Protein: serine hydroxymethyltransferase
Amino acid sequence: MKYLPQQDPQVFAAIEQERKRQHAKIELIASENFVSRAVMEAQGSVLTNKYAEGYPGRRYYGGCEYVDIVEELARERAKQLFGAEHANVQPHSGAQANMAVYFTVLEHGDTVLGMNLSHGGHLTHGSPVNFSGVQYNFVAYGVDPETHVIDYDDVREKARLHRPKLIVAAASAYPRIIDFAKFREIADEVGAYLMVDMAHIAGLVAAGLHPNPVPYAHFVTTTTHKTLRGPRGGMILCQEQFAKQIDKAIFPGIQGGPLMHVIAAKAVAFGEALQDDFKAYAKRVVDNAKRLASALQNEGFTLVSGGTDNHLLLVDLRPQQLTGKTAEKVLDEVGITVNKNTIPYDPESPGVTSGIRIGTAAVTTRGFGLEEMDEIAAIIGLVLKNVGSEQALEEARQRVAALTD
Amino acid sequence: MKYLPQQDPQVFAAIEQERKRQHAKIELIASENFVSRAVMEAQGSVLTNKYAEGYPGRRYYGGCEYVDIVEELARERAKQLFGAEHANVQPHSGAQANMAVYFTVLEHGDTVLGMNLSHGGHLTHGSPVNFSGVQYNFVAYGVDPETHVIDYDDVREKARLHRPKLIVAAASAYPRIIDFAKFREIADEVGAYLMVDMAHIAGLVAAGLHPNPVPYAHFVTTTTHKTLRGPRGGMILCQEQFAKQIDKAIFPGIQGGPLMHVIAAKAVAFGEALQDDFKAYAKRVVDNAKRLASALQNEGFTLVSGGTDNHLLLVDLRPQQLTGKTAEKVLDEVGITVNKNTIPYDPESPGVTSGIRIGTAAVTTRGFGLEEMDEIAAIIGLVLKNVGSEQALEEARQRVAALTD
Ligand SMILES: Nc1nc2c(c(=O)[nH]1)N(C=O)[C@@H](CNc1ccc(C(=O)N[C@@H](CCC(=O)O)C(=O)O)cc1)CN2
Ligand SMILES: Nc1nc2c(c(=O)[nH]1)N(C=O)[C@@H](CNc1ccc(C(=O)N[C@@H](CCC(=O)O)C(=O)O)cc1)CN2
Structure:
């Protein structure tokens, strides 16, 4: 950076502080990743200066000759990546992506079937404090109390009983494979649309390491910044018969000017995902998750569903006699950055929580392998089984520093 | 750029063409500006990797120590810049800034009073093809058919008649000063809340060249990328009594994770606006627009409202038999970039329009003075009056290149 240190030392210092922290700490937040320097150069470009309301060739402004190309690259690479008939790459967020689809098929107060928050579901899947629970009538399905797996019989029962207009499958903290065909089977039985939110597993779907929801869903929504390893933003994938409707929902429906620089960055992110070395990368994330889960089990931690089938695992911290709020803070002190996370049937509210959610997507990107996962789990063990010990706390800091070196 | 040209040639070529076009063409899109290289460096930072749901000190993730500083800086500066009691810098957009406020003070179907689209109002101020007009019952106020100035008597009438829960003031294509005193006076008469959308005029307000809405409004929504000359995104300013409810409306209400990198650039922009430089700049913006307006009138163009008190002007193109769509396309040919824009009482639809909107915020940033505005108005006069003339289009191209170097 050249001009920022000069004009704004306060902001620059804060950024450099953060830039060092991302290298000095061990980022284990499941939804987080480290983007390429090409992705950052794209959003750090002049495309922020451009108003491009509308779509390629159909704009409400002049001078869009070149941002139209950037957006077409994004749309076509997306369709190539997931096999979808249509793509919308303008959503500013996953939330805005989800919001748009809801705005497309649902009237105010319509019945929607979504995964319960504490069981794994996202805020936009029907949380009472989110716009989804407020705007639409959400009924919640969930997981088994013992196996912690989606009860599709429960789902069918709810669908037959409540007769929803749309069913939403997918989750923010479900360590297992979701069967989209069963969800579609249930949706056709009750005459409902199917939405799948692949935000967390989007990079795994592109790499063939999680079954594709696209052939089974009318609408597929995603973020671009999780396992897809792109810029902070959203995306919608749909069948040709919903293309125009979805596009109008984004604009003039729920958004205004699109972020063309972030859209440019999306195109790079998708270009990177199309390459072979991303499949190799994605395999390492899944392998690093399976190992870390098993390594945490060896330390004597308990995990929901007994492990993982994808990128993330969910530690139940009840036997360790700790809340997620403590675990997060104490691990953050020594170098391990996680997030407090709600477990199925969690006795605590989503601000306190009875567990922590760990992801391997970020650490894999910076070159950590199987041998490294073993040390991560041992540090987490040393810290969480010896809470108040300043000796264990300090040893952990030396060991984390040895990893990030 | 160092890594994008090698990684993604197709995306890099498009960005460079766009970069060249920004310099080569005369960008007169009223809602566009050119950010500093410092603002660009901030958006391209590693802050894009951080999930920071919640607020400084109240985060649902770990490792936020530094992004918190970035957000605090953005907020405290915004308060210093506008004299607001509270600020929210997380809105992805001006669209989302407005949406959250509507989500705070309004329930579904509620009556809201906002400015008509063609009379100058924005899409989010009650369009029936926008969520605002679909979620809420919007009654429209407009401007006088002869003077094109807000009929405040009509606003007062519409307010007494429909008893709205909220009044929205401010516009996308209103070339005159909006009396906020009168709006609050009206809002207090019917007991309604007042929201002002200063998005377009934020930079002028920061410089004491437009009456500040903050003292008169309960809520002040804005974009950061217009006359404020910052990154693409939104912001909410409000009185202290709504502070907590506003923060909840953004998250977990209508948005997910904030764009921390954009919030860094938001902090940089407000810092640029706090300097003595900015006030001088903003003066030239208003002076250049006033000159360009007068110069266009000498050429024979009919201007909505007869001139401009701000950064913006609307050309009524009906006398010269041209739609806005046509005028936008022909000026693009000669190297002048505007957008087609609806005028008060437009006989045509928003996709065709009877006029064009012109702003000076962007050309003033690159150093154009009062003498450049004279030339620009001459070129626009040469082209739009000699539409088919191929020798008139070529002379324009040469005069545009003489200005842009
Ligand atoms: N299962 C699951 N885990 C997740 C998410 C999620 O949406 N679902 N998240 C993705 O967002 C992150 C956490 N974000 C969250 C933010 C707010 C609330 C929430 O319900 N807040 C309420 C209740 C507060 C309390 O009682 O503690 C509120 O603020 O009123 C939940 C999750 C990470 N883990
Ligand atoms: N006064 C004003 N000027 C403005 C805006 C605005 O919101 N208000 N804009 C805000 O950024 C841009 C225009 N954006 C717009 C986009 C769509 C529609 C609209 O009503 N579209 C309808 C019908 C259009 C058609 O097909 O002819 C539709 O899409 O169904 C209007 C304005 C530029 N100038």
Remarks:
- Residues 276-298 of chain B form the longest helix (23 residues).
- The longest strand of chain B covers residues 111-115.
- Chain B touches chain A through 95 residues (CB under 8 Å).
- Chain B has 16 helices and 15 strands.
